[PDB]
Each structure stands twice: as structure tokens, then as C-alpha cells.
Amino acid sequence: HPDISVDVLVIGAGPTGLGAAKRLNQIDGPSWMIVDSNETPGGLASTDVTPEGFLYDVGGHVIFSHYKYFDDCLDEALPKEDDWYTHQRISYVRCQGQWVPYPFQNNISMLPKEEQVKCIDGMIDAALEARVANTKPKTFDEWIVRMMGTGIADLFMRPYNFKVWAVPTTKMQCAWLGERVAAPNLKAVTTNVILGKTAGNWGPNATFRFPARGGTGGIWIAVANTLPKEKTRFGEKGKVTKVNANNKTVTLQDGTTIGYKKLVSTMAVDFLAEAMNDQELVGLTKQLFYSSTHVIGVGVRGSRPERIGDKCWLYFPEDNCPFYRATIFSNYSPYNQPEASAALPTMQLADGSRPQSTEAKEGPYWSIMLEVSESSMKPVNQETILADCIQGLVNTEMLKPTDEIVSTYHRRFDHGYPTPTLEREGTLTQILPKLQDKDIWSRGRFGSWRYEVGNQDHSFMLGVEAVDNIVNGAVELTLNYPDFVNGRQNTERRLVDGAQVFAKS
Amino acid sequence: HPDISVDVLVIGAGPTGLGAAKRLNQIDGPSWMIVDSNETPGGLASTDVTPEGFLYDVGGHVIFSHYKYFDDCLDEALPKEDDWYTHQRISYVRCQGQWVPYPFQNNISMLPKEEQVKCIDGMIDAALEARVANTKPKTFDEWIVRMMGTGIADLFMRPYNFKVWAVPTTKMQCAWLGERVAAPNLKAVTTNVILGKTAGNWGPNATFRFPARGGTGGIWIAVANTLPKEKTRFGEKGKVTKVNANNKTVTLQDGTTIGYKKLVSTMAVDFLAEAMNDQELVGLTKQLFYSSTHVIGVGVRGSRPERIGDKCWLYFPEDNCPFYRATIFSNYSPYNQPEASAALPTMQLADGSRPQSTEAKEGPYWSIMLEVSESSMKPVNQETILADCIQGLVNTEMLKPTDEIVSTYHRRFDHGYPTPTLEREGTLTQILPKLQDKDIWSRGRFGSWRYEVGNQDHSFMLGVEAVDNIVNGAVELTLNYPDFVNGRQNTERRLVDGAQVFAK
Amino acid sequence: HPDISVDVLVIGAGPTGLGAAKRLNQIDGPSWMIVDSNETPGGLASTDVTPEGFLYDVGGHVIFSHYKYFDDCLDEALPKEDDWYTHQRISYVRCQGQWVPYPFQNNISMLPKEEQVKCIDGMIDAALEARVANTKPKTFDEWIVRMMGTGIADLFMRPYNFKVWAVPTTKMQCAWLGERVAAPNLKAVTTNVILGKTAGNWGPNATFRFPARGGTGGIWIAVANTLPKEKTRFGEKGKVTKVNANNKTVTLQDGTTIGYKKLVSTMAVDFLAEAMNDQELVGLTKQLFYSSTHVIGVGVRGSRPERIGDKCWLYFPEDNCPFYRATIFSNYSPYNQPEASAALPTMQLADGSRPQSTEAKEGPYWSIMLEVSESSMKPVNQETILADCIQGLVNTEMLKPTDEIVSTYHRRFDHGYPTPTLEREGTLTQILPKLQDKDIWSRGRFGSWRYEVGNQDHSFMLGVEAVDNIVNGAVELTLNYPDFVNGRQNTERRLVDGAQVFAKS
Amino acid sequence: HPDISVDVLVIGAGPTGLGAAKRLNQIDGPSWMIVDSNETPGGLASTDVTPEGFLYDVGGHVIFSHYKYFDDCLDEALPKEDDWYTHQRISYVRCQGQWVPYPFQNNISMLPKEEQVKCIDGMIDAALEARVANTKPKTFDEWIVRMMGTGIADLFMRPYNFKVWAVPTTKMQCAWLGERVAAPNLKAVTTNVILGKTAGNWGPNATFRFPARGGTGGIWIAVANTLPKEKTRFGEKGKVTKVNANNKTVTLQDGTTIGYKKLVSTMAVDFLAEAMNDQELVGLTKQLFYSSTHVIGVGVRGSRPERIGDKCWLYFPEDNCPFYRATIFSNYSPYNQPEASAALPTMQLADGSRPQSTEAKEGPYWSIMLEVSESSMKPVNQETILADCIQGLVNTEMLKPTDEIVSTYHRRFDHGYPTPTLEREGTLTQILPKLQDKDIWSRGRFGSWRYEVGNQDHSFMLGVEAVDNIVNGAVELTLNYPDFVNGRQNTERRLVDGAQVFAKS
Numbered sequence A, C, D: 001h002p003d004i005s006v007d008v009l010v011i012g013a014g015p016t017g018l019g020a021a022k023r024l025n026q027i028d029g030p031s032w033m034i035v036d037s038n039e040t041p042g043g044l045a046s047t048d049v050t051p052e053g054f055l056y057d058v059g060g061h062v063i064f065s066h067y068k069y070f071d072d073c074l075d076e077a078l079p080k081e082d083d084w085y086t087h088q089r090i091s092y093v094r095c096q097g098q099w100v101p102y103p104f105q106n107n108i109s110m111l112p113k114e115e116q117v118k119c120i121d122g123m124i125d126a127a128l129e130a131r132v133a134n135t136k137p138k139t140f141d142e143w144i145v146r147m148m149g150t151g152i153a154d155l156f157m158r159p160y161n162f163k164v165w166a167v168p169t170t171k172m173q174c175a176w177l178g179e180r181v182a183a184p185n186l187k188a189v190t191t192n193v194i195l196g197k198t199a200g201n202w203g204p205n206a207t208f209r210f211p212a213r214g215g216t217g218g219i220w221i222a223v224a225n226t227l228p229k230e231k232t233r234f235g236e237k238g239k240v241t242k243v244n245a246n247n248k249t250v251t252l253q254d255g256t257t258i259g260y261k262k263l264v265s266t267m268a269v270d271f272l273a274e275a276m277n278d279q280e281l282v283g284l285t286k287q288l289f290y291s292s293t294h295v296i297g298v299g300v301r302g303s304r305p306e307r308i309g310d311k312c313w314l315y316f317p318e319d320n321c322p323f324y325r326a327t328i329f330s331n332y333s334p335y336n337q338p339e340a341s342a343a344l345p346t347m348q349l350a351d352g353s354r355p356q357s358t359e360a361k362e363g364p365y366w367s368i369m370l371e372v373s374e375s376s377m378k379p380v381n382q383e384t385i386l387a388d389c390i391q392g393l394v395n396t397e398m399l400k401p402t403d404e405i406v407s408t409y410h411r412r413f414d415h416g417y418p419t420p421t422l423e424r425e426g427t428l429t430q431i432l433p434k435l436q437d438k439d440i441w442s443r444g445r446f447g448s449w450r451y452e453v454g455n456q457d458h459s460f461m462l463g464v465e466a467v468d469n470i471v472n473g474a475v476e477l478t479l480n481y482p483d484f485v486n487g488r489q490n491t492e493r494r495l496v497d498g499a500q501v502f503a504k505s
Numbered sequence B: 001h002p003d004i005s006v007d008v009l010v011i012g013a014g015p016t017g018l019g020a021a022k023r024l025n026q027i028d029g030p031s032w033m034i035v036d037s038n039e040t041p042g043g044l045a046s047t048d049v050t051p052e053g054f055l056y057d058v059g060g061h062v063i064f065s066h067y068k069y070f071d072d073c074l075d076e077a078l079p080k081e082d083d084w085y086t087h088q089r090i091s092y093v094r095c096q097g098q099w100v101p102y103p104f105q106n107n108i109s110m111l112p113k114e115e116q117v118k119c120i121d122g123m124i125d126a127a128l129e130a131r132v133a134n135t136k137p138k139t140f141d142e143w144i145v146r147m148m149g150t151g152i153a154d155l156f157m158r159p160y161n162f163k164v165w166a167v168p169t170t171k172m173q174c175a176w177l178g179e180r181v182a183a184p185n186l187k188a189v190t191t192n193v194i195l196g197k198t199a200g201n202w203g204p205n206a207t208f209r210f211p212a213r214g215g216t217g218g219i220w221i222a223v224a225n226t227l228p229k230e231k232t233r234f235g236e237k238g239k240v241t242k243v244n245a246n247n248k249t250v251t252l253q254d255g256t257t258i259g260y261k262k263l264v265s266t267m268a269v270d271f272l273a274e275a276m277n278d279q280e281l282v283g284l285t286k287q288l289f290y291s292s293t294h295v296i297g298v299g300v301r302g303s304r305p306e307r308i309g310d311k312c313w314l315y316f317p318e319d320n321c322p323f324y325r326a327t328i329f330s331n332y333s334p335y336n337q338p339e340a341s342a343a344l345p346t347m348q349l350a351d352g353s354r355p356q357s358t359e360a361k362e363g364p365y366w367s368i369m370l371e372v373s374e375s376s377m378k379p380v381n382q383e384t385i386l387a388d389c390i391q392g393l394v395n396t397e398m399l400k401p402t403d404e405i406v407s408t409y410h411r412r413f414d415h416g417y418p419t420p421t422l423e424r425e426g427t428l429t430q431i432l433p434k435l436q437d438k439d440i441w442s443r444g445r446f447g448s449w450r451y452e453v454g455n456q457d458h459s460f461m462l463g464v465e466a467v468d469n470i471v472n473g474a475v476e477l478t479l480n481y482p483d484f485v486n487g488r489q490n491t492e493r494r495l496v497d498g499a500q501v502f503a504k
């Protein structure tokens, strides 16, 4: 007999695991428990803070929900109006020393004239071939050339996507992008070139809210707080070291054993294979691909420069900086960095030289969060990446050479993005059903490895829907039909369902 | 305060209502109750019998299940292997003196060559056009011609569908057919023509099962029997006459009042609006279109003729018979008609003449079930339709003039098919949201009026999913996404889910 | 027996007849003569002069030669370099207050933006449609729309062509336009729009030459002059009144009769039929359609205005003027109008008002030549047309209200354009063979009624080739295969052929 | 100064040279003469006879004319009705034991059902792709696949064409085939498949005439006979050995020199380059490609067998025989082989065995003429080719093993077909104009190397038109525009033109 027995054990307390927990807690039927090796829940949706008081999320995190259930839980956890800030998405792409509104492909109008001709010519060729196309594109690259043409492909899509995905567009599938990659309309785009008009509204994150305190991690801390504490085990005491799939037993680092009837595993599935000592699973998970994410944080002295303004996040396709994206993190909340009266010495100027004075001085302060991808196809020198990011901020004119840096942050996240490679699905349809036969629901950004349903809401609902399948025979819609859930408002499932209304009387 | 109060009230005990009831019974949470004006549950999935002992379903009823949950409930209701008979899905199209295997286009080698030429030319035109198509068809008619070409459309799908729907194909939408591209398989069709080959779309793995006893209606009696009797109210005592949606009160014919928190209504939505005395909904539901169904049954003396053979159901595009479909119902179960030793007098011969003798003779017997549609655009003379069907049987060479008819059956079903008109969705998306705002789940063949999710399995699951929506916040997939549920096997939901395992 | 007998009789001494005569003269085999009712050769390629000394051709006459033989004859006729002036082929379209360089579509950058948008959108439709087109257009109108799209077609080619042909574009065939595919050059059009530029289809290479003296008519006087005078009969003495086909006899005004073995007739075929008293051919030729041409000339005082500049001919699609084309005729040669020292009084101001003085003043002078079409489908008030044209010049900003007009000219030419109606070929394939069965070669702008080979060079060569068919069995390429002769370098036939080189030895 | 001096020298007296000569003789202006290294004119349109009395043309030669001028000359040369026989083309393709009516691709209906499926499927794929194609095929092979599909390509077009052309279809251009390779109509072909109908009327030689005596060579002997003998020089005395383009002098084998002003050369252009001692031209002509033709003749004892019947010529794509074509030469004229009363011993049986006796027996007789191609890509064993042909006749059931052969013929013609390679036009555009600038008209099947205009009537007219260009400035239409001359009735040029009629008066 194990030290503990539950009907449903949940491994991991990032958004996916917390979703499972919240639904299990709502249903209030089967016995359950949730573990995490980190004292603080949140996973990749956590927030660090530097010794100088600058917060950094794990790169640009912005909340946009496809589901009422997710909204209910966020609202329950942070109920007050002042718990949140609402923002309009101000996003641009850096091209030829100018800012082009996102998305690039919908704003050819803001490019130099020569590039406009190249881009429109390409789009015209794409339009004409699309008129007689009877096959579907097989790769990301093919999709790009078919929907946008060579000009936009060469000028932006190919270099940008390598820079973020850390693999070439030719290596990726194209079934994942319905809600990620705007397909430009030939008429609309040439119309906007003629009129000198912009088109900045595409996509589900054109408007967003952000938590007032604690960064994104504050959401997940607060959501986890609504759970019955005795059913949680966060910390070294919650680290899973072994999974015995055959005896339905999990063993924690400190030796505690947990018996389960059903397992919801949200750890990276490659890690799960290893913990299962299941060599067949290990070899299959090794066929999957992922990129690592470097997050670099820079804290800067001074009121917000006019050149920065209300910008939220910014894309960098070009080669004068190593990061693919920058977020003006100080625009998301005034509590993402120190108050103006906080005294901090300058650590260095942006040009890398030492400050004239070592004296602690006041603010105000603003804050830039940078992301740099890494993979076996795109190596990164970890020792120079911080300095390279800062010089890149100078190169791109985000920072003046004389700007004063009062805080820095660098952290590498090994599992950053699950790459939509050509091989992904062939591999997953071997992995998942083999786990499913053992009553293991492997779910989440790396639990199920599907980026198109890899945001916080998707993740949370992967957890919720796993529970709903386990208990109520629900369809795992988010897991198996990304375009379906992303294309509709999912209003049916609520934090209070009829089951609870009826049972209360 | 009403005589009875329940959390969820279910109106109607056809497949849809029985689905709601089965799921509620499984969940064993909220209180509930199911009513029907008929003593026998089953609705349009019920079965009649003539005084001569010949059963007739409400027209051809062949089960193809898209759902494990539905299978679970059928298996539970009729668990024994000898409760069912299995058959291949054998069907033909009657055309120009031939039984052409379905699908029609793969079998046109049976037609005269000159006709084959016109068919192939038309399908070539359609394939060339499909190659450069950049719009979807807007009408059923457009969809038909783009798939088949002119000549083939004119021979089968066009005239057949008018005889079925009782409205022209030019007046119907085509989204209900699903997302498949409307385009010919030119090579498959031309290949069979070149080879002089025929081929039906059936075989050892393309089968259906039919209940051994009581016809299709036997399934629903069995399913209903698994319910707690006290939570059902079937018959005159269960007829709903008034629905006060603001009080959430329903009034029965005998005067009994039922209070509910949520209503699952499976009656025809047009009757619901009348029962609600809601003038806006009456006006809206009166904008929907439907056809009535005449079911004609003919019992015949003799062993099964070779010309009939293993045929299951048959299509009639031509105008030498009024029915659009015939079913050799005697092929579905031996118990659909009397045993061979049963003695019955001949009522008439197939050509209408009187029999030589009035004496009762033995069988064996076989049985034909016919369907004729009726709408404002296609009237039916109820006084001659039986005789006209029987003449139709002679014209189509199903019966010889000498065949001895020993039983006849005719019944008209007012609400038979809900029509996928071009206007349907424009109307439904005003009716359904309004009923939803009043906590009324109107669901079913005429509850929600969507033919593409209008079979027994869809109907059942419409009731199941409505309850799952009410209780567990489930998505109503069958209701809103027919292509979704029809394109996959729905395995997740079971008669025994985790929740019931953990509870015990 | 007739008064005169020849092998080959040529009726008409316009370019077609002169071509026939030049080839007969070169061949110097069969006997021949050429007659004309006019003492001056040239036909519709003649030139008038006003009492004030302003020359006017019969509307804008610009030579583009497809044939070496035609070049040879023009050179022989006017051999000196100073017999010609050379000009670039400079033309514009008057549209919405702008002079848009030709071709119209490559220059829509001059139009307002919202209109550019509508033009480009329509041309995009046209390009997409052209990509899947498997049929040839059947009318002029369909051809226009397929080449240009709706918006651009509505701005220029549609209203302009109605004003030219005096019949709707929907009533004309399109084979006469050549074999080129009716499809947009979308990239060239959007590229000039994107670059905001203009560009006409002329330059140092795209030029025409124009006779230094006597207008276009000086060419044909000089060509005719190389003929043996005794073989010509020009004037009232040369007017044909009767053609007896069955007897092969022609009768002139003064009662003179000419017998022939072969007849080359260049008179309007409908007139030929009348002259033949052939009721059947009369009935057929009346089924042909033609427009009449009003030529209006305006002589103006002043040096050439800057706004006019080097413009040569100009197109007018809009209805603020009755003319479809204007020519800056004073730009073709300084001898098309009086020298600056010549003195003329002002007849009226461009706004119609009387001049302040009636005194004769000096120049310099410039000159405008306008064309107005007329047909049953489009009447012309011959009494107001001059004044309407002059108002048109003001409306189109060609003339200021103050401009001083010193000379006016108006002449109506009954057979002006042979119309390429949908019916034209069905009628001509009945007419020409019947004439051919009688050894009658009916050829020329109205001799054979085919606009696409209705220019000076085509006409001249129609006569040349008819003679060559008569004598040497040559194929009549120009007559029967317009696309062939217009698409190739016609260098084989020369004014001096082997036959003449060999004979003189 | 040279021994002889003429305005126009014609080298070669095959159809092309005789065409030149006939026209120079009709014009009767410039002096001229014609020379040939052979005493009997006719070139590749000549006829041999075996010692046993069996005639053989140089492979299947059948007369079909696009030109009245050609007709006039044949009719003048052989004016009597009994000089000619008229025949319906009866032509088949040997495929899988069956005779498939010509053209193969229009008679899929005669193939076995399984092959019908493969062929139609292929034609369906081709039709669908052709619906959206916007590029011309570049190679013969591409054209084949595009117009007929892969089933017919593999079954018939690819093996058959290598077998005639002696190069693979991938090496040839496709601009030459308008009148040679039928493009099948999907509806028509599948309709005949369904109805079991044949379609055997395609093409310009569906009906033909053949001279009653002397074989094809009889025509050119008779045509040459109409020329002034003193202007001809045929035999060793007329063999050109040297051409000096700069001096415009030709040297014959016997040392005779001839000065010309204009040269019409009809010898193979590669021979001309060598004779010119012009290394640059030799180098260019070596870039052309040609196949050699082996003609094999077999005379057979017996009345015409029923399996042969009225067959004219037959095609053999299969590798069970070396010949690409067989002609039933005895069907063309009763005078192509001996009378029935002639006694001839049996030389061999068709199975290869010697016959019993040397007894000379009577006929009647019939005759098969076979063609085998050869090139550097397709060697032929000359020592066995006769026996291989005869065994081929047995494999294809044309001859029974016991058939008695009474005469055999074999001759190799070095230049047989000028191959339409991809490179041909590029090379000819460097060759022909260079010769033209030296007053050399190189014309004919190997004079100008263009197969699409390589028939007897084409060749003749290339000579006629060259003279017409030289004397009268005519366009050389056949040479430069094969589809033009092949698609029209060429009726204008006659043996008696207006010129001769007028001068005779």
C-alpha cells in the first residue's frame, strides 16, 4: 500500500495542472491531489524578480481567453477591478530603422517604396497561383510562399521565424497557424499601400488585461490559493522522481508514494517518459523537438522615453540584435518595477561602459524584457548573451548609448516552445495513446506538445477537459481540435455548472 | 404551487427525450421527469402492426450509429445476440427497367450506351469546372450538378430529391450535406463504364443491425423500460397542453401542473410555440418548412421472389410510381410478418383484381414498406394513394399482376421531414436563442429541426447532450456542429463514466 | 470596242490606288491606267488649307509603317532630309483635369487615390479571371474589360470608343485588335501606382516623321508625281459613273469608256456596288456600317503655350467636349500654319466673344485639329459643331477664354471609319468573293472595309499586293491576315526587286 | 572568268531544286541552270527497282498537296488520268496482336478494356491539368504527356517515336507537330470507347494519289523532263565539289566553274558548309541532328492475302520487329511489282529456310516496303537488318513462316530525317541568315532542315518561293511559317500566272 491514495493525481501546478485541480475541486466527487516540485505554482507562467525589484515574466505573456471557464477562475482569484490593467495591443515590427505595425504582412504600406513593389509583386504571384491551386501546402514555408509570396517571405517571414522557432520554416508543419499567422488579402493590402493606411487590429490579443501585482505569476499563485491546501504538495516535497505506470504508483523525491486510479501529468512528456523508465516512450519523446528560451531583463533609469511610448511588444526580424522580441514590461503595470522614489545605483551605461557615479539615485524607471531562442540548429553563447542583448538594444535605438541600466536579469528556460515540426503528429499519435492505455492523461504545453493550444487559457482548459473526460466522458476538444476551440466562444463550461446549483438544494 | 416539481422536465419520449432521460438517470443528480402523450414511447421511431400481423416502421428505418453512448444504451436494452439481426446495407435505384446499384453514378454501365455518353460528357464538364471552382454551391441543386454533372443529376438526384423533400432542389441549402467538395470522381465513374462493371457500396463490413422483434419501435420500448417507472408519465395522462415559460410551469391534459427549473422539449418546435401561447414564436416557427410522410405497407403471399432477393431499400426517381423509397421490410426480421403456417385470405391481386377464392391460405409471406411525401408544393390524395402505390409496385416490377396481397397499411404522419430550405437557419437562429433565454432546450428531429442530425442516434444524443449541457456545462456538439459529430467516432461519453465508477 | 483598253484598271488615287499604280509601274509588264474623280491624289490622306493659311489633314494622320516597300516609295517621293520632320509619338488622355500619359493604365497615379483603389481592385479581378479563362472574348467590350478591369475601362476605353466609333463597344467585334491575350499587366500597373510615377510609351526610339510641306497630302502628291502622267486621269475627266462587270467596261463622267481584264477598285465598296447597278451587292454593302468624320481646325495666335508643349495627339473620353481626339498640328511642321510675320485679324476669342480690335496682327501661330464622329446612333448638329468644339477646347483647358482664334475650318467626310461591327465579316465574306468572281479586286479602307489594315501603309500595300496577286500570284497577306502582317518585319518586297536588277543587264 | 555564268544557280534536282527550276522556267527572266550529281533527278523522292522487278520508293511516300502550284506541275508532268491512282488512306498501328486505326490516340476504343482504362485515366489527368496550364510545353515528351497523358505516352508515343526519330522524345522540340501528331479530345475519345467506334479520318493524307508507273520517282523524272535540257546538268558532270561564296563561284567534279548572282542550294546544308570550306559553318551544321533511313523491300509470291487487304501503311511501336513502318507498296500500283505471269524462283521462305527447288514459278506478287531508322543514339546492324526485318514480318503475322519471298532490297540513306531537336532553331538562326547574307538560299528537307515543311509539296514550294523571293520580293512563307502554309488553301500561285497571260498578248 502506498503512503497516499487518490482517484486522480495531478502532476504539475502550472496552468494546466491548476486547471485540472480547479475542475476536480468544483466537481467535488473523486478524491484528488496535486503536486509540484516548485513551492510556487505557475510553471512557465511564473514571474521572477531581480534584487533591485524589477519583475520579469518568462518572456512576453499577455492574457487573451477563448473560454468563460478560464475567465471565471481568473475573476474568482483576482476579484477586484484594481487587480488588473486593460491595455490595447500596441505592437510593431522593426524594419529598416522604422516601426511597422503588426502584423507586418498587413502593413506593406509602411515599408519603403522599393520593398512595397517587391512585396506586392510577390503577393500578386501568390494570388494568381492560389486561383488554380488544388493541393494543400505541406510545410510552414510552402504555406508562407502560397499565402504571402516570396517578397514577404524573404523580407520578413523566413528570417523572423528562424529567429523565434530556432528551426527553418521548411522544417515545420502548417496546421498550427490559423490564429497565429495573418493571411494577407491582396486587395486590402494594396488598398492600404495606395491610401498610406495602417491595419493594426488582427488577432485574438489585440486587447488584453494584465495583473496589477506580481506579474503573470500572481494569477497562478492566487488561483492555487483557492484550492484546499491539504490537497496540494508544492516544493521539494512535491517533486516526482518515479512513475510506475503498471502499479499506478508515483514516488516523490522524499520517498512518499502515491497510488492513483487516473493520472493527469502536466510535466514535459519527455521528462515523463524518463520518470517512467519506459525506454520505448523515451525514444519516441526524443523524436519531438523544442527550443529553449532565454529571457533577458533590463531595468532602465528615467521617465518613459517618447520613442518608447505606449508600445507593448515588438518584433525584430533583422540581424542587428539577437532577440526576436522585446516587451515594454513597465507598460503592463506600474508594479512591475520600483517606484520613482526608489534609489538604485547605475550598474552600467547601455554602451557597456561604467557610470560616472556609483551613487544610488532615484527613478522613475522603465523596463525591457527580451527573448532569445536556442536549439541544436541555432546555438547561443550563454556567456555573452546578456551583453549581446544590451548592444542590440543600442543598435535598434531602443536604448541610447548613455542610458543608465540599474538592473539586469538572465534566465534560460530549457523547454520554451514545443516546435510544430513536420514529424510532431506522427510522433504524438504514437506517444499519447500508449500513455492513454495506462490511464495517463499527458496534457499541457509540453504535456501534449501542441503549440496552437499552448497559451495559458488553452493549457488551463487542457487540464479542465482532461478531468471532464475522466469523470464525465467529455470530449477533449482543446487537445484534439485546436481550430475548433480557437474559432468559437467557449461559453458552456462554467465555474458554477447546473450540477452545483442543483446539488445545493 | 404546482402538483409536481422537478429540476429537469423532459417533454416527449421518442429517441431524443429518451436520451435526456437515460443521461439524467445515469447522472443521478438533479430530479427529473419525462412525459409523452403516447402510452408507448418511441415517437417516429415506433412501429405499427396490421390486424393481419404485418409490422411497419414509420418508413425505412436503418440505424447507423456515430456514438458509443447510443450503442451502450441499445446493448443494455436488448443485450442478447438473438435480439438483433445483421444485414448488409444493400440498396438500388430503379431506373429505366433496371435495378442500378447505389451509388448510382458508379453503375451507369447498366444504361443504354447513348445515355452513358451523355452522363460521361456531363461529368467531364463538371470535373473541368470543379478544377477551377472558387465558390461553394449555395443550393442543393448547385451541389448536385457540381458533383454529378447534368445528365447524371437529371436521371437520379434531381427528380428523386423532389419526390423525397416535396420541394425543388433549387430551394434547399446544401451545407447540411457536410463539408466534402462538390466535385466528380470522374476516373472511378469512367472506369466502371469502360469495364462494363457494377459495384454497390456494401459488403461484409458495411452492415446494420435491426431488432429481432417489434420492429424499430421495439428498441425504444426496451430502452424506456430501463427507466424508473415512477419518473415517467406516458399516455393521455402525459399529454402536454400548456407551457407557461415565465412561471416555468407545464400543464397536462388532465389538469396536472409540473414545475421545472430547466425544460428539455422534444415536441415539434411549432407545437411548442403554440403550447406557449407565444405569438412571436408562432410567427417564427410557422416560417419553418416540413413535409408529411405517407407510409404504405403491403403484405404479399409467397416466398421471397428472386428478383427481390437480398435488397434492403430502394430509390425511385421516376414518375411511374408515387413513392420515393421502398423497403423489403420482410428482409429485416423474420418476425416483421406472420410465420409461414399462419393462414390469411387474399385481399386482392397486385393488378387490383379480386382473388379466385376468399379462403384463408398459408404463407410464407413477404413485405414491402413504401414512403410518399406530401407538402403544399406536392399534394397527396389520401383516398387513392394506397391503390396508386400498389399500381406503382406493378409498374416498377416489384410485384407481378398476379401477386397476392394479404395485408395493406396506410398512415399519414404530419411532421415527417424537417426541410433544409435556404431559409431554415435564418429562422432557427431566431427561434432557438429565444427559447434558450427561457431555459428551454428545444431539441430533436422537429425539436431543433435539423435533418442532418435527425436520425435515431443524433436524436438520442441531442437529448443526452442537452442534459450534459444543463448539468455539466458540456458543449452541444450534435446540435450546432453536425459535420463535427458525423465525421468522427464519438467514443468519450459512455453509459458508465468515471463519475459512476468512483461513486461506487 | 471601248475608247481605251488596259490589262489592269485602277479606280481611285488615294494611298491604295497609288500603291497599285506604283507596283504596276515597277513591274512594267501589263498595261494599266489609274483614274480619280479628284485632280489631286491622296484621298482621305489629302490635306486642306484655310484662306488664312492653316493646313488640316483629314484628322490626325500619323504614319507607322509595317513595310519596307512603303518606306521605299515615301523615300523616292521625298528624298531629302529636310522633306521631313521627326517627332516622338507623344500622346495623353484627358481625364478629370489631368493630362494622363498614354497608355492610361500605367499612369493612374495622377488620379485621386480612392479612384486608384477602385481601378486596381477591378484590374485584380481581371487578372484573376484571366488566369482561368478558356474562351476568347467575343465583343470589343469584353476585350476591354478583360484587359483593363471595370474601373479602368469605365474611365477611358469604354467612353472614348463610343465617342470614336459612334457605336457602343458591345456592338463591335474584337478580332481586329489582334491575337494578343486580353489580360492585365497587373504588376506594371500597381508598380507605377506604388512608385507614384508616370511614363508614356514614347522615347527616342518611338518616333514618327511628318512631311515638311503640304501636310500628309504632300506625300501622295509627290508619290503620284513619279507615275507616267499619261497613264493617269485625275479630275472630273477621271470620275467613274458606271461599272459594267459582265462586259469588263468602265464609263467615266465625260462618257469615256475603259475596257479592262482586271479591275482594282479602291472606291467605297458600297459606291462600287451602286456603280455596278448590281442590286444584290447593293443590298449586301448596305449591311456594312460606317461613321462619318467631322474635322474641325482652329488656328490660334501666340507662341505655343507651355501647357500644350510637345503634345502630339490627345484622347477625350469625357463628355465635356464633342471631339474624341485633338492633334497639335502646328507641332507636326512649322509649315502647317503661317510664319510669325504673317498678319491676321482675330476672328473671335475662345469664349466666343468679339476681339477688341479688328486689325491684322502678327503671329506666331499654333493650330489644333479636332475630330468628331457621326452615325445614325450618334447625330451631329453640323450648324453648332464648330462652336461646340471651341467650347470643348475651353472646357478641356486646351484654350484659355482669352485665346485669340485667327482661323477656323470645318469639313464633314461621309465615309470616315469602316466600323468593325459584329456583323462586318459575315457580310464581307459574301461581298468580296462575288466581286472576285468578276475579276474585281475591291481593296482599301472602304474598298475592303477593314480598319485594322486601314492605315496609309496598309492601304498602299493592299493595292501593291492586289497587283502582285494579279500578276505574280502573290498571297494577299495584308487583306486576309492583318495579325500576320502587323506582327512581322515586311522586308522582302522592294521598289527594286531582282526582276528589275536582272532585266537591266 | 568562269566557264558558265547565270543569274540563278540551282544546286540539286530533288523536289526542292526542281521547284526552283520550274519557277525560273515559268518566269523566264533571269538566266539559270540546275545541276545534280545524279543522272536521274528526284533525290529522296526517287525509286529503285530490284533485278526481279520490284520497285521501292525511299520508304512510304504518299502524295498530299497543300498547294495548287504543286498540283499544276504534277498535272502538267503526268496529264493523263491513267497516270495516277487515287487511294483512301488505310492505316493502322500494331498493338498487342491487334490493328488499332490511325491515329492510335484517337482510337483507344480498339484497345483491350484494361488498356482503355489506363489510357483514359491518363487522358483525364491531362485534361484537368490543361484546364489550368499557362505555359507551353518545351519538349516533344512534355507535349505528349500534356495532350495525351502517361498511359498513351508509355503504351504508344514514347516507344514509337524513339523507333522512328532514333532519339528519345525528351530531346525534341514540339513546334513541328501541328499537322503530324493528333491531339486527342477527351469527350470524343471516351465517347468512341463507350460506343465501340473508330475515328480514322484525321490528317492531311487521309486521301492520296500515287503515280501509276515508275513509283514516286516517276513524277520527278517527268517534271524534270518539262525543263529545257540545255539548262540542266545531271550526272557526274553536275556534281558540285566546291562552293566559293565570296567569288560567287561553284566548281563541279569535272573542273567546270559556274558564276552565279544568286544560289539556291538544296543539298544538305552540312554538305554545303564542307563544300564552302567554311569552318565556322561546318561547326554550326554539326550542331544539327539527323537520322539515317534503311529501306528494306520484300517481294512475296501469292495473291494478296486476306489479312493484308487494302492496308496502305502500318505503324509498329513494339520491339518485336526493327521497322517503325511497313507499306503495302503493291497496293499503290499494279506496276510496282511484276505481272502474275512473270516467273520467279523462290529466294527464301519467310522463316528463313531455303526453298526446295530453284523452280521459277508464276505469281501473282505482292510487296512490302519497310523502314528502320538509325542514328548515333540507335545503331543498326547492316549485315543482319534484312533478316531481322523478315523475322519481324513473321513476329507481327504480316508473313506466314511458309510465305515465299521472290525478291529482297536493302539500301541505307545517310540523311533520312532532319530531326526537330531542342537545339535546331537556335542553330538554324545562326546558319541560314549567314548564308542569306552571302546570297545563298539554302532550302529543302536538308537544305533548311525543317521537317514540318519537309514533304514533297513543301520541298518543291521551298524552291519555288526562294525563286520568288529572289525575283519578285515574295515572302518565303513555307520556310518561316509552316503552320500558316499548312493551315490554309494555297491557291494564289499558279503555273500560269497573270504575268504569262499578259505577255502572251
Ligand SMILES: O=c1ccn([C@@H]2O[C@H](COP(=O)(O)OP(=O)(O)O)[C@@H](O)[C@H]2O)c(=O)[nH]1
Residues within 6 Å of the ligand: D060, D093, D101, D102, D103, D104, D105, D160, D161, D164, D180, D181, D182, D315
Ligand atoms: O497513330 C499514330 C502514328 C504516328 N503518330 C505520329 O506522327 C508522326 C509522323 O509520322 P507520319 O508517319 O505521319 O510521318 P513520317 O514519319 O512518314 O514522316 C510520328 O512521328 C508519330 O509521332 C501519331 O501521333 N499517331
